[model samples]
Target: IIVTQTMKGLDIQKVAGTWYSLAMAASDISLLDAQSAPLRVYVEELKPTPEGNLEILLQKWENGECAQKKIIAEKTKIPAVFKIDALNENKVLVLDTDYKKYLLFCMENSAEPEQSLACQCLVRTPEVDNEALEKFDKALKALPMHIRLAFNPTQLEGQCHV
Candidate 1:
């Protein structure tokens, strides 16, 4: 397994809820309508990782069906597992994964359409955080960078249990 840092007493429970996708971090925000909702992520599992920080299992629901985790990381066969990077009263979680990449989101209970509101989310990729991205790039530079076993996205796409 890849070696990771662990911090204890981290208040991560604040992120245990539903989050709606407002836009993609890799996409052009100006080209898209600001009012449109693109995707949604449901937080199913939330617990302290062995490293003592909260680890989360987030699932994306789309088009009357959920996008299987397998479909998300097909290129590298990695699960979209992320570590809790930040916890805010606004229900913000900066999810950082082994790739050292991160995503940011704001969560709240929904009152419209009778469904939970993902509220507002912004894509924060590694590229945006130059410093952190450099560290991540270094970790991926060599083999045995402790690459953890990950599920293949091709076999897992559209399937549950990622």
Candidate 2:
């Protein structure tokens, strides 16, 4: 099993806010096909719960309409490490981030126990930046080859309200 390491000393408050899903990859799943949506626009709203957990709201535009999914995540013993109730098999890892931009690493080991299932999600604000893009690329390359997959671009321009 890949020992995914989380960033140290993550400020949950700093991480909370609106973020845009620039790209993402998943094993045995073509994210686009799974969603069945072309011209996809993914938006994430991270809110802090009073209990010190995160209320994750993920939204995406498909067929000219908006769809959403909600999940709850709690902090783990390790900094920047979180356990998402929806992703029961793997602890979500904040592999890299600066609040403005971030990379989420998750390994789904239960469904395909023999071979670990991995996912890398890249997020940023509505405004894109070269530096952030470079950093995201670097982080993705750092992952193991067996899990590496192309981060299919999303049509994020003018797709979100905030």
Candidate 3:
């Protein structure tokens, strides 16, 4: 599997907030595909725990309704890298982020013969800046061909409801 370094020197507190999913990608071998319908949406709410873990609330459209999933991301010794053991990965990489406009996160599997990569781009607003969009596109293009997929289109209406 293609390996990339996670972002460094992140202030976990600064990263804690709400973000709207703008675009996503996953390898063909990935089991969970990012939803493509414009009506469907994905939203994330991140809160810092007193114990130093990050509480993540993920809401996504499922079966015509919003479905919720709660997970905790344990911070590692390395900043911006978290271990989400439930996802069967050693690390969830915070690849890039401005903490205000857009952020990119990715996961790569180590399993042989079925390796996969998944990436999601988040924006603070539904309307993303042209420069930020271009940067995100460039990052996607740098991924290994086997792990790269088309950037799913963004929604123009209905920001995910709480």
Candidate 4:
């Protein structure tokens, strides 16, 4: 029952850089559990390849060790859309972003009825401005997303390198 729109002009260069997973909300709460392996995959780099694809350098921790993940979000006809083949060809939509400040994005498998859904707010810094913070909250609320399982992705900070 919600109408969503992607950022009109999503620039790969602007969105590139180390980012922290500030917060997240998902339709399937279980998928965002603290123990979920793909819970807080933050971006270290977002590269635009010559083929008009995006190469994302991601990282996460498991069993007390940090692991890096590289994924090429293949470009789509729409500027704001990309196909993450690694996620069973799940689509990633650049809902909104300010490049240097915060980025709001969502993910879902391309099933007709959307079998699952998840979204997160990524910040250039752990401590984001209040205005930016409120915007993120409102973004989720606008989706009519109830925020079933809210969590702090920074909790595992020291557990791995920054």
* Candidates by lDDT, descending order: 4, 3, 2, 1
Please give, for residues 27-70, the per-residue lDDT of candidate 2 as tens digits: 43333344443212254677876666777676665455666767
Which stretches of candidate 4 lie above 4 Å from their native place?
1-3, 61-64, 112-115, 144-157, 160-162
Predicted candidate 4 versus true structure: per-residue lDDT over 1-162, tens digit per residue: 545577898886677667766667765545455643454465566677877788878776766667787887888989888988664437777888889888887776767213356677777776645666677777777664544433354542533333
What TM-score does candidate 1 reach?
0.24
Better of 2 and 4 by TM-score: 4
Candidate 3 lDDT by residue in tens digits, 43-119: 47778776567776776566767678666778878777776654444456688888888878775555631344666
Measured against the true structure, the TM-scores of the candidates, in listed sequence, are 0.24, 0.68, 0.74, 0.80
Can you tell me which runs of candidate 3 are displaced by over 4 Å? 29-41, 61-65, 87-90, 112-114, 145-162
Where in model 2 is the C-alpha error above 4 Å? 29-34, 37-41, 60-66, 87-89, 101-107, 110-124, 145-154, 157-162
Q: Every model's Cα RMSD, please?
A: 16.6, 4.7, 4.3, 3.1
Which of the two, 1 or 2, has more lDDT? 2
**Model 1 CA RMSD to the hidden true structure, in angstroms:** 16.6
CA displacement after TM-score superposition, residue 6 of candidate 3 (Å): 1.0
Q: Tell me the RMSD of model 3 versus the true structure.
A: 4.3
Report lDDT per candidate.
0.30, 0.55, 0.61, 0.66
Each model's total of backbone clashes = 4, 0, 0, 0
Model 4 quality (TM-score): 0.80
Point to the candidate with the largest lDDT: 4
